[PDB]
Amino acid sequence: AVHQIGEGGLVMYWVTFGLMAFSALAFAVMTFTRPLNKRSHGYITLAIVTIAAIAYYAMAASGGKALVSNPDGNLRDIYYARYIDWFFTTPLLLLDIILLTGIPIGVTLWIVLADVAMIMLGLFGALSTNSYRWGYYGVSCAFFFVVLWGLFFPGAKGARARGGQVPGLYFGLAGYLALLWFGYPIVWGLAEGSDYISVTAEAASYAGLDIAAKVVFGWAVMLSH
Amino acid sequence: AVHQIGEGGLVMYWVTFGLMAFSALAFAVMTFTRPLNKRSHGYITLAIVTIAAIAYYAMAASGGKALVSNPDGNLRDIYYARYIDWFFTTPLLLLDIILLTGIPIGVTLWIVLADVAMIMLGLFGALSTNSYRWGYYGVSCAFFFVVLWGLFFPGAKGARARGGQVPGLYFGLAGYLALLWFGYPIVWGLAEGSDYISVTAEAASYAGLDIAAKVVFGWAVMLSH
Amino acid sequence: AVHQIGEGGLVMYWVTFGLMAFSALAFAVMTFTRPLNKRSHGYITLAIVTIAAIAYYAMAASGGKALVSNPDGNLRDIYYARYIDWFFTTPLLLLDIILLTGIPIGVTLWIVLADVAMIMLGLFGALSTNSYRWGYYGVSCAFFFVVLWGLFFPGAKGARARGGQVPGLYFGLAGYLALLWFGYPIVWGLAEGSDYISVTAEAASYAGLDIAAKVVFGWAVMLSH
Ligand SMILES: CC(C)CCC[C@@H](C)[C@H]1CC[C@H]2[C@@H]3CC=C4C[C@@H](O)CC[C@]4(C)[C@H]3CC[C@]12C
Ligand SMILES: CC(C)CCC[C@@H](C)[C@H]1CC[C@H]2[C@@H]3CC=C4C[C@@H](O)CC[C@]4(C)[C@H]3CC[C@]12C
Ligand SMILES: CC(C)CCC[C@@H](C)[C@H]1CC[C@H]2[C@@H]3CC=C4C[C@@H](O)CC[C@]4(C)[C@H]3CC[C@]12C
Ligand SMILES: CCCCCCCC/C=C/CCCCCCCC(=O)OC[C@@H](O)CO
């Protein structure tokens, strides 16, 4: 069988595009308002939703996908565009909260590299036509746990060391992030991995997560400067 | 119909390759002549024409293209190689003149990111098989205007603030750049966009522009240190 | 004919994967042992064998390759994955020894860029379906010689200037590196270039070289801190 997106998925792509694009314009206003030395979280958060807006437009316009054979015998549309999005946006999301903590660049570096490895191995698993897809998935899950360790140990120490409003903002955003980001490997296991849920279900599920992880998250970042 | 390059286009690729490659060797001599602390514009300008030489060789040797369906029903050879070129060379061209101005890195950053977005969205539009090609094009045109705003407002302020020979060199190069770079979205509208002009006409038109934007421009940069 | 890997090549991929992966875990232990300010060669060497482990897994799992027409009339499986590996790992290998020398960043920059050009032009040659493959190869060989010049002239001067244990370590590693890295364009000439040796012979030959260039080399780096 050929498993591709339905109407419900395409509308979710357009809805999600609109949310990201609106957020991008808003955050551009809010950022270029602020003085040059105060723009860091602005630039980062703007870049997150701008890149996601570009990816969502692409997917809504029937780009950024390729039909890939799953070992169950179906051809499934793999939205490689989402991984390109995540390659830039997930390190940016992490930096948005890591920058609160003042930890050394050396520590931040291995957290973001654990994150890019996570995404890249997911991509490779998604483009695999065979059972070795699951080795990619499992090692990527290990790297996700490296990222979480980074957030809840050295990152957390940094935030508590700074004190003031930093711990509340950091633990609030990091706790939300940590819990939310578990949605992604779950959806992947069900979608690109096992070809169990429909591509519409996949698209809608990743869209909901992306709205939570970028729109909700981003507005929270932007509204607490 | 299948729209591909003719002989006139391939010779223009070889001619343009020769011009870039000659310029690269010359600029390598001129740069490694100069002392380590004086090499910046040298390295940048060398990199521009070296990368363009590699891209032009590739296209002359029948690489860097894929046949893509245009909604008019023709298959058109899209030279994705040129966009890979532009991804590196257009930020480098901008840096070549932005470095004259001493503006903050924060400003330079959003100018180059506006530029990379411009190129990338052009690529996506070029690889699109449907009418959403024009949304890519229009937003990319907006980003081009962001780049020009960067050059003619903060960049321009920086140059005038420095004074001396900087304003004359900056406004001369930036004015030439600004006007010349309008050629690209015009050609694209006629070529990758609408499939209106032949691929030979496309190749020749982008070649002429590239010779002006890199060979002429580069020699002007290199001959005013 | 269709030239693809046999069993001997796939086992060599798994063996090589195991060696890289073991080395990655070991080097992770050794690096996160050391204090934050002493981790540079650790991080670099860890990254080398981690990336190679990912590439070798991919190739062992039948990814990272595409069938490409050689002008001799055969279709040959080109392992583009190896070039993606080399794009990151060969600059990292160079930095691992260049960091001993204290030379200016400006010099290190053109050495690594000569190296990335070398790899990229090899990739382009490998993906070429025609005789222009050899122009890519020859220019890439020139860039290899640029890299070696970098190592044996400014890099070497830096090392001798520092003195102490640096010259012995630098010249030992650089001499080994220089000689060993000649294996790659030889194998390429025989494999991706001319389609003369089998893909199994290719895989085994690049694996042997990679084990020498990353496992042996990496253990030597890690065991001389
Ligand atoms: C910023 C840089 C370093 C990384 C971002 C670019 C990466 C993630 C991009 C660049 C080119 C992309 C690939 C180009 C072409 C295809 C063909 C299709 O059948 C499957 C997806 C696949 C294979 C893409 C996957 C994502 C990709 C690998
Ligand atoms: C330096 C990094 C971050 C960016 C530069 C690399 C980008 C622009 C390159 C990497 C791989 C490239 C893609 C790889 C394969 C194909 C297949 C072809 O049918 C259409 C072009 C397309 C899709 C290429 C377009 C350009 C591309 C996306
Ligand atoms: C870190 C960034 C800047 C560079 C690393 C990414 C580059 C080297 C990667 C990104 C996408 C890759 C390409 C994507 C798709 C294909 C299709 C296949 O038929 C031939 C290989 C080819 C064409 C790949 C070659 C390597 C590639 C170009
Ligand atoms: C048919 C479908 C079935 C496929 C099943 C495969 C699923 C595999 C799941 C993987 C579990 C995650 C493994 C990860 C286990 C932890 C590894 C680790 O070292 O990371 C933590 C530290 O680095 C922190 O410092």
Ligand SMILES: CCCCCCCC/C=C/CCCCCCCC(=O)OC[C@@H](O)CO
């Ligand atoms: C059949 C072919 C017809 C297709 C027509 C589509 C062409 C669309 C053209 C686009 C016009 C350019 C829109 C750009 C308008 C300006 C947007 C903007 O905000 O940028 C300026 C500021 O950022 C500066 O600070």
Ligand SMILES: CCCCCCCC/C=C/CCCCCCCC(=O)OC[C@@H](O)CO
């Ligand atoms: C059928 C197969 C036959 C194909 C033959 C093609 C092989 C071509 C081989 C290339 C030889 C290498 C050329 C390289 C020659 C040196 C060029 C150079 O300037 O580099 C050195 C300096 O930069 C150092 O500072």
Ligand SMILES: *C/C=C(C)/C=C/C=C(C)/C=C/C1=C(C)CCCC1(C)C
């Ligand atoms: C805006 C997008 C976000 C926050 C995306 C996050 C994605 C992840 C946390 C993905 C994780 C994955 C794994 C842990 C294993 C398998 C592949 C995944 C990439 C989807």
Ligand SMILES: *C/C=C(C)/C=C/C=C(C)/C=C/C1=C(C)CCCC1(C)C
């Ligand atoms: C050496 C190459 C140069 C200076 C190339 C410049 C290219 C541009 C200014 C391209 C601009 C584009 C748009 C404004 C919209 C549509 C896509 C374009 C990429 C060709």
Ligand SMILES: *C/C=C(C)/C=C/C=C(C)/C=C/C1=C(C)CCCC1(C)C
């Ligand atoms: C761990 C991997 C290593 C050290 C790979 C090294 C690869 C090279 C030195 C490759 C060189 C090449 C040329 C000089 C010309 C033709 C293409 C090559 C890429 C294989």
